[PDB]
Design a binder for this molecule. Structure first.
Ligand code: DGL
Ligand code: FE
Length: 318
């Protein structure tokens, strides 16, 4: 009568989702939390004795690592496949996206007009020297973005890009995504890269100071006239030895319902994955944007190459 959810992605507001699921299915949700890579290690080590039914985390790169650890089993569901865009789920049906984030250009509104922005590729141009802030190469979001660039350009051309990008750093990578947004607002950089939901989070904060930062920083969705913006996922899958496989599948299917999509996405100011679900009020002012159709599993497949490239060009680790 229960499922065991091992998640790094729980927010307090998600209790509404678990309670609705229980009303609809009869199944309790037992929550086990941890950091994503630690949960993968925990499930792998628990092995055939693991009680885990569902694993959830952020970033297709981490979901790929879970898949490679052998802790997931494939699921074939008409509901999951029809409702989740193909680009946002594993080609092998091992994991699935349930909310979406974009890795965007954050820009100082005083110093940068959006007409000056275009693509990720343009960020390697000399005009940005001394102007870019971004976090360390240890961060999965950055690894996944670089992986996408290696997929497009190949290692040689991507290395040339990365050499110019790193040359443009205003300071050594320092702090998290929110720290980059604050540095852009403060004039330490004119532009930075961060996930969309971090600006939204500031635009909603209980702290007035957070609203002041948010008002100074715009969000630009790159590559609109070409392949589209780099998107990534919060997602999950059914665990290999799930004691309640049937219940685990019911939970994933419930997550694509319109009501669950709203609660889950809005809990972290992310976009829904399901077509037709209304967008959070905080995200509407930024407008819709073209998403790249690349399958997000590529981000994991080329994660090791991204790490190698980052080291080669001297993009500092945390
Ligand atoms: N950075 C948070 C944490 C969740 C995670 O790191 O798994 C998020 O984007 O939801
Ligand atoms: Fe995050």
């Amino acid at each position: 009568g229960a499922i065991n959810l091992y998640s790094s992605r729980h927010y307090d507001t998600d209790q509404a989702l678990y309670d609705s699921f229980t009303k609809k299915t009869g199944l309790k949700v037992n929550l086990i939390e941890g950091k994503g890579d630690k949960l993968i290690e925990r499930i792998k080590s628990e092995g055939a004795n693991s009680p885990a039914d569902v694993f959830m985390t952020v970033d297709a790169g981490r979901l790929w690592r879970a898949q490679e650890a052998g802790i997931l089993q494939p699921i074939s569901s008409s509901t999951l496949n029809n409702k989740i865009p193909a680009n946002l789920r594993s080609p092998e049906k091992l994991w699935f996206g349930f909310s979406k984030r974009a890795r965007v250009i954050m820009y100082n509104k005083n110093k940068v007009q959006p007409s000056e922005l275009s693509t990720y590729e343009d960020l390697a141009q000399n005009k940005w020297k001394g102007k870019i802030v971004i976090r360390s190469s240890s961060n999965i979001y950055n690894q996944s973005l670089i992986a996408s660039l290696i997929e497009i350009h190949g290692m040689s051309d991507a290395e040339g890009w990365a050499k110019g990008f790193v040359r443009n750093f205003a300071r050594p990578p320092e702090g998290n995504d929110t720290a980059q947004i604050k540095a852009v607002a403060a004039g330490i950089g004119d532009i930075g890269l961060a996930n969309s939901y971090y600006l939204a989070r500031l635009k909603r904060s209980s702290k007035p100071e957070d609203q002041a930062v948010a008002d100074k920083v715009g969000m630009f969705f790159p590559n609109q006239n070409g392949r589209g913006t780099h998107v990534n996922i919060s997602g999950g899958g059914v665990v290999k030895n799930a004691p309640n496989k049937e219940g685990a599948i019911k939970f994933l299917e419930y997550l694509v319902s319109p009501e669950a999509q709203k609660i889950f996405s809005e809990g972290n100011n992310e976009y829904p994955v399901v077509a037709g679900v209304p967008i959070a009020s905080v995200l509407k002012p930024f407008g819709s944007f073209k998403n790249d159709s690349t399958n997000v599993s590529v981000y994991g497949k080329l994660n090791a190459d991204a790490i190698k490239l980052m080291d080669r060009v001297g993009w500092k680790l945390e």
